[PDB]
Amino acid sequence: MLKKKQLTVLDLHPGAGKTRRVLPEIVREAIKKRLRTVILAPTRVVAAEMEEALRGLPVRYMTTAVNVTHSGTEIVDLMCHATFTSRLLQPIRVPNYNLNIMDEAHFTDPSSIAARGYISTRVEMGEAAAIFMTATPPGTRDAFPDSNSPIMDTEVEVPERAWSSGFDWVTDHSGKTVWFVPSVRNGNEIAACLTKAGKRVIQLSRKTFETEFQKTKNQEWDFVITTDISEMGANFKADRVIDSRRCLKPVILDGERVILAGPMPVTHASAAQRRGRIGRNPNKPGDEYMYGGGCAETDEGHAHWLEARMLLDNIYLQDGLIASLYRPEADKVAAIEGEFKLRTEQRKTFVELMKRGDLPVWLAYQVASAGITYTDRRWCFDGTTNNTIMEDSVPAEVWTKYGEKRVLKPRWMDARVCSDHAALKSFKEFAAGKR
Numbered sequence: 001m002l003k004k005k006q007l008t009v010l011d012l013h014p015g016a017g018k019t020r021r022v023l024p025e026i027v028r029e030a031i032k033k034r035l036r037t038v039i040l041a042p043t044r045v046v047a048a049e050m051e052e053a054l055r056g057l058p059v060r061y062m063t064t065a066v067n068v069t070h071s072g073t074e075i076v077d078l079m080c081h082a083t084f085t086s087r088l089l090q091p092i093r094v095p096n097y098n099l100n101i102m103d104e105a106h107f108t109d110p111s112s113i114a115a116r117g118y119i120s121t122r123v124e125m126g127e128a129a130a131i132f133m134t135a136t137p138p139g140t141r142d143a144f145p146d147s148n149s150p151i152m153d154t155e156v157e158v159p160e161r162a163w164s165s166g167f168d169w170v171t172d173h174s175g176k177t178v179w180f181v182p183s184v185r186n187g188n189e190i191a192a193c194l195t196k197a198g199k200r201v202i203q204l205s206r207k208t209f210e211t212e213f214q215k216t217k218n219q220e221w222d223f224v225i226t227t228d229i230s231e232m233g234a235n236f237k238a239d240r241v242i243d244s245r246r247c248l249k250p251v252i253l254d255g256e257r258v259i260l261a262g263p264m265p266v267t268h269a270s271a272a273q274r275r276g277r278i279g280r281n282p283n284k285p286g287d288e289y290m291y292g293g294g295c296a297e298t299d300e301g302h303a304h305w306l307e308a309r310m311l312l313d314n315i316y317l318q319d320g321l322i323a324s325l326y327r328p329e330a331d332k333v334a335a336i337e338g339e340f341k342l343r344t345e346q347r348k349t350f351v352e353l354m355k356r357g358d359l360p361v362w363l364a365y366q367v368a369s370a371g372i373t374y375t376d377r378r379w380c381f382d383g384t385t386n387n388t389i390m391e392d393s394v395p396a397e398v399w400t401k402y403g404e405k406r407v408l409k410p411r412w413m414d415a416r417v418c419s420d421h422a423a424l425k426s427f428k429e430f431a432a433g434k435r
């Protein structure tokens with residue numbers, strides 16, 4: 001696996017031991033061969049689980065999620081998928097790793113797709129080896145893979161709103177349930193309905209993941225209501241998964257705006273990962289998987305693959321060459337390699353709008369390519385009337401950095417800046433010049 005010019009896909013079924021059993025063996029072999037190695041974790045929670053599996057091995061943990069006193073002689077680095085891509089983009093020297101290991105390599109966030117593109121190109125060039133660890137590689141058509149113990153799979157109508165009757169099976173259950181919803185707002189309504197019925201509910205989403213995930217260990221719960229973030233190695237002690245089989249899809253319209261389309265069917269990879277949360281204990285057969293719709297290839301035309309191209313066009317590889325997306329996911333976007341390449345100063349603005357501004361990739365690109373500087377927020381207020389952002393059925397308003405009350409009306413509308421109360425609050429702070 002570790003020899004140059006080779007990319008290996010380690011596709012053992014969910015719960016087969018890729019992280020706890022296979023990963024330490026690969027690391028020992030890499031250290032024995034003096035291979036400068038990088039291990040890429042999707043989240044800070046997975047990074048913490050990896051430190052437990054690799055305890056006693058000389059690994060440099062480039063994350064504050066782990067508290068370790070490094071020796072300074074480690075040749076193995078561990079960091080998140082987003083940190084790797086961020087460091088490549090910035091004027092920071094990233095070693096050219098001989099071995100690149102990506103855990104939960106199915107992650108479809110733009111920074112993860114970009115990391116796969118960069119690593120696979122280095123391998124194609126004959127410069128590095130790579131191991132992608134996932135039960136569901138890109139393009140998988142099997143939503144029902146093998147598991148540690150048998151699962152009861154049931155196609156059933158799943159509520160997506162509060163209900164009064166017709167879904168007794170949901171609340172009549174006495175075990176623990178992990179329920180995947182298409183959005184934070186949809187999970188809020190189902191959570192409220194379950195709480196009113198006497199259930200103890202925890203909610204998880206990208207922004208709250210590390211903090212709220214700890215509650216799944218620290219307190220008794222009946223339900224976990226989660227978005228698709230829990231498809232990336234988050235493990236639970238549960239006996240049932242309820243899966244709406246739906247997700248939101250960011251779509252770029254006429255290259256001028258981003259909408260959150262759907263809810264629409266999840267990919268087979270996502271469904272297999274959601275189901276994969278249960279059937280993990282070989283001594284507990286009969287875990288349930290209730291699913292409320294079919295699968296479709298909704299990653300085709302999904303904005304994340306276009307956003308991965310914007311990131312890869314701005315990463316130095318060799319002279320004017322640009323890394324391609326990983327071959328099995330390369331047809332998900334129609335893009336000219338190099339079309340998003342920015343000049344030095346615009347690239348710096350693009351990076352800062354993402355890193356400090358916390359803006360979606362697409363939106364950060366529109367601002368930086370228009371020649372606007374990071375602190376210039378006039379674009380948050382000079383868009384067309386149809387770009388007015390609404391809050392509680394009335395236009396959102398902020399005090400500008402000049403002390404003037406203005407309606408939020410960005411020149412470029414990206415629905416992810418107001419997909420929920422938390423996102424809109426963060427965007428309002430940005431428009432006001434507060435970060």
Ligand SMILES: CC1(C)OC(=O)c2cc(Br)c(O)cc2O1
Nearest residue numbers: 060061062063064065070079083
């Ligand atoms: C990832 C980030 C920003 O934060 C860390 O926790 C960290 C730790 C080490 Br060690 C390192 O070399 C670099 C790092 O930079």
